[model samples]
Target: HPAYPMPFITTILGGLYPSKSILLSGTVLPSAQRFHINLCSGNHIAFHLNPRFDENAVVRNTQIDNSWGSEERSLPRKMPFVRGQSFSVWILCEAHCLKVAVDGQHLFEYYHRLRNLPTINRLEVGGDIQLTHVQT
Candidate 1:
């Protein structure tokens, strides 16, 4: 039932430095339980974003050594993405924190868990999501 790879992973050609922006446009499945959109550096994830449909929560965290730090769960508003509906995500690489937006609304400012910015040279997307567009 899948044409594209289930879990998508790619190396961001030039990697992220200050002022880099990321864009992803997609739709959730009618039965989407959850899904992931993540950024990578070294052997670990720099940003891990997950959406849980049942809980109406977004899981935010980053792990450098396989062990996760404290996760962020509160939302700026109620859950932004809807099942079977199109959505857009934007990420801005700032000097201090990660700026995120869904549609046109600001989602959160996620602080850096690990300090280095430029080495986050990968992007990953997974599960129950219809990825329509992407720009890094």
Candidate 2:
């Protein structure tokens, strides 16, 4: 077993990958976008993004990682266990950084990386773990 309260169960491999992604803009300029994604195995993550975003455009992705560095959050942080004991947590993936939110609250912003992926159509919400979203 990997860890308790994971939406799915599997070995906690050393590697952490981008499990899901929500496209905010493609052609038209976007002001802001929000997405609600489900998670498994309360673990910290690093968000990926493209290098291009329109002016005045902002994105937000948040997660619950108490162990994250106050200086640099783009670096991996061993997230605290945020299963049934707590409420839903999120990791914000913005246009030029990462933000972690706890219980629908903004925590902090880590200024790093330019989020510019070409596939700005829809959100991809599945990873190695298996769940109702993945099973069907």
Can you tell me which runs of candidate 1 are displaced by over 4 Å? 1-4
Each candidate's lDDT (Cα)? 0.87, 0.31
Per residue, candidate 1 scores C-alpha lDDT tens digits across 1-136 of 2334668778897787778999988889998999999999979989999998988899999887898988999886889988998899999988899999999789999988766787889999997888877788
Tens-digit lDDT track of model 2 for 1-136: 1222322323323322344222121111132122223322334323322111222122233233534323222313333222222233355445565455543555556554223322222223322211222210
Weakest 10 consecutive residues, lDDT, candidate 2?
20-29
Q: Go through the candidates in order and give the C-alpha RMSD of each one to the true structure.
A: 2.1, 15.4
TM-score for all models, in order of appearance: 0.93, 0.28
Model 2, position 122, has a per-residue lDDT of 26
